[PDB]
């Protein structure tokens, strides 16, 4: 997924909000690793919003 | 005269009163009310207090 902003911390076990509530939600365990990185070099297409 | 029949009753009443007394006493936590923990913290970090 391409979630942006400070809501990256919301994508985690718990820590609900606006992004991690009605779009996607990790379990209360989430045995794994969350990998995030900046993508303001390819997602700069304002036309494709 | 009847003092050794009250010592057993007083020791049991003290043990029962001390056991209930240790309920309104948190152990290095926010509070000693379970309802005041789940609704005052996030689910993931709720099960650390």
From Swiss-Prot, chain B:
Gene name per UniProt: S
Coiled coil feature spans: 6-49
Organism annotation: Severe acute respiratory syndrome coronavirus 2
Function: Subunit of the fusion protein that is processed upon entry into the host cell. Mediates fusion of the virion and cellular membranes by functioning as a class I viral fusion protein. Contains a viral fusion peptide that is unmasked after S2 cleavage. This cleavage can occur at the cell membrane by host TMPRSS2 or during endocytosis by host CSTL. In either case, this triggers an extensive and irreversible conformational change that leads to fusion of the viral envelope with the cellular cytoplasmic membrane, releasing viral genomic RNA into the host cell cytoplasm.
Protein name: Spike protein S2'
Highest taxon in the source lineage: Viruses
């Amino acid at each position: 997924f391409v979630i942006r902003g400070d809501e990256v911390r919301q994508i985690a076990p718990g820590q609900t909000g606006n992004i991690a509530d009605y779009n996607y939600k990790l379990p209360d365990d989430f045995t794994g690793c969350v990998i995030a990185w900046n993508s303001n070099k390819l997602d700069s297409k304002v036309s494709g919003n | 005269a009847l003092g050794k029949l009250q010592d057993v009753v007083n020791h049991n009443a003290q043990a029962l009163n001390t056991l209930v007394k240790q309920l309104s006493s948190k152990f290095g936590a926010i509070s000693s009310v379970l309802n005041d923990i789940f609704s005052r913290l996030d689910p993931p970090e709720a099960e650390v207090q």
